[PDB]
């Protein structure tokens, strides 16, 4: 229960942070960069993280 | 003397470059660190969220870049760019903040080439072309040896023939010879037909014609195979009905592309026509098209050769004799011979006997004959 409620308090606290965009991968290249489309706006390249 | 010049300087290249560069490599350092420094500096040059479309280029260091939202913005280019790849209409890369031109990437084109270029090396080769030695040698003179040996013409003075017409009845291996030329030549042959360029609306036909010619010039110094054109234009008529007027415009654009004001690359035109007397007298102008070639119906010996080459991949029977088919002294194109062979095979298959028979070939003859 304590974990649940701590989670709730933090959830309220830091939901002020903005979310994320959903992009359609179009092409990939060297780990440094990978292409992706960000609907509705045009197609770009992104610097992927360490996933 | 020219050989001496080239050999001397070539040895100079080998010695200079190889020796000095290998000395530096033996002292490899002072290169990799600088390369890594430069690569990371380029990465530092903003690579966030980024893309750009090149509307046009003003000059070195300055150009206009438009985004999907119409962000036309003019920007000073960053020299890090590859440069010289900045053809208008190219997909540029732009910094998220300053929209700095730092990269360009398309790696994708209209698949018109992949549509109009199918089976670049068909199964038919000059071995598969049974007969017509004179026509074969003339078309080779016209097309291949200009390309495979660009020395004789260069040393003697003239440039090779540009357009070559192949005229004859409906079916004499015109497309076959086109295919064989494609297969034997390393150039990117282009198949084209006369029933597609007739577009629904004004300007469409000439537009695709000009695009096809530009594609031919760009991607490869190759052949363009224009099939029947008599369904197009048929000379320049009084120009009364709108459709025929537009088609006449399409031929005039073809004529400009065949020999226009500006220039023409190393792309050869090969026309295939069933009837030639009705074609534009001006289009065949000797300056543009030369080496019109008769492609007549095969004679008896040519018919023998055609049957043999068609049936090479056909285990004929011991009793099957391929002379009753040469017997017929009537219209039998190479296509007719292929149809006869295929019909004999199919009828044998239907009547369930694995081996074809003389009677089967006979029946194929009667059922392939149209008139
Ligand atoms: N040397 C040859 N001359 C003419 N036709 C041939 C020859 N060798 C084979 N053929 C046959 O001719 C057919 C192709 O004729 P094609 O080029 O379509 O004539 P057209 O283009 O006038 O319709 C093929 O089916 C092929 O089997
Ligand atoms: Mg043909």
UniProtKB/Swiss-Prot annotation, chain A:
Cellular localization per UniProt: Cytoplasm; Nucleus
Signal peptide: none
Organism superkingdom: Eukaryota
Disulfide bond annotation, renumbered to this chain: none
Transmembrane segments: none
UniProt subunit comment: Component of the 19S proteasome regulatory particle complex. The 26S proteasome consists of a 20S core particle (CP) and two 19S regulatory subunits (RP). The regulatory particle is made of a lid composed of 9 subunits, a base containing 6 ATPases including PSMC5 and few additional components. Component of a complex with USP49 and RUVBL1. Interacts with PRPF19. Interacts with TRIM5. Interacts with NDC80. Interacts with PAAF1. Interacts, in vitro, with the thyroid hormone receptor (in a thyroid hormone T3-dependent manner) and with retinoid X receptor (RXR). Interacts with ERCC6.
Family: Belongs to the AAA ATPase family.
Function: Component of the 26S proteasome, a multiprotein complex involved in the ATP-dependent degradation of ubiquitinated proteins. This complex plays a key role in the maintenance of protein homeostasis by removing misfolded or damaged proteins, which could impair cellular functions, and by removing proteins whose functions are no longer required. Therefore, the proteasome participates in numerous cellular processes, including cell cycle progression, apoptosis, or DNA damage repair.
Descriptive protein name: 26S proteasome regulatory subunit 8
Swiss-Prot record, chain B:
Family: Belongs to the AAA ATPase family.
GO process annotations (BP): proteasome-mediated ubiquitin-dependent protein catabolic process
Coiled-coil intervals, chain numbering: none
Localization of this protein: Cytoplasm; Nucleus; Membrane
Residues holding ATP: 168-175
Record's subunit section: Component of the 19S proteasome regulatory particle complex. The 26S proteasome consists of a 20S core particle (CP) and two 19S regulatory subunits (RP). The regulatory particle is made of a lid composed of 9 subunits, a base containing 6 ATPases including PSMC1 and few additional components. Interacts with SCA7. Interacts with NGLY1. Interacts with PAAF1.
UniProt keyword ATP-binding present: yes
Source species: Homo sapiens
Illness the protein is tied to: Birk-Aharoni syndrome: An autosomal recessive disorder characterized by failure to thrive, severe developmental delay, intellectual disability, spastic tetraplegia with central hypotonia, chorea, hearing loss, micropenis and undescended testes, as well as mild elevation of liver enzymes.
Membrane topology, record value: Lipid-anchor
Keywords carried by this UniProt record: Acetylation, ATP-binding, Cytoplasm, Deafness, Intellectual disability, Isopeptide bond, Lipoprotein, Membrane, Myristate, Nucleotide-binding, Nucleus, Phosphoprotein, Proteasome, Ubl conjugation
Record carries keyword Cytoplasm: yes
Function: Component of the 26S proteasome, a multiprotein complex involved in the ATP-dependent degradation of ubiquitinated proteins. This complex plays a key role in the maintenance of protein homeostasis by removing misfolded or damaged proteins, which could impair cellular functions, and by removing proteins whose functions are no longer required. Therefore, the proteasome participates in numerous cellular processes, including cell cycle progression, apoptosis, or DNA damage repair.
Modified residue annotations for N6-acetyllysine: 200
Placement of covalent cross-link Glycyl lysine isopeptide (Lys-Gly) (interchain with G-Cter in ubiquitin): 179
Compositionally biased spans, kind Basic and acidic residues: 28-45
CC per GO annotation: cytosol; membrane; nucleoplasm; nucleus; proteasome accessory complex; proteasome complex; proteasome regulatory particle, base subcomplex
GO molecular function, one term: proteasome-activating activity
Region (Disordered): 26-46
Name of the protein described by the UniProt record: 26S proteasome regulatory subunit 4
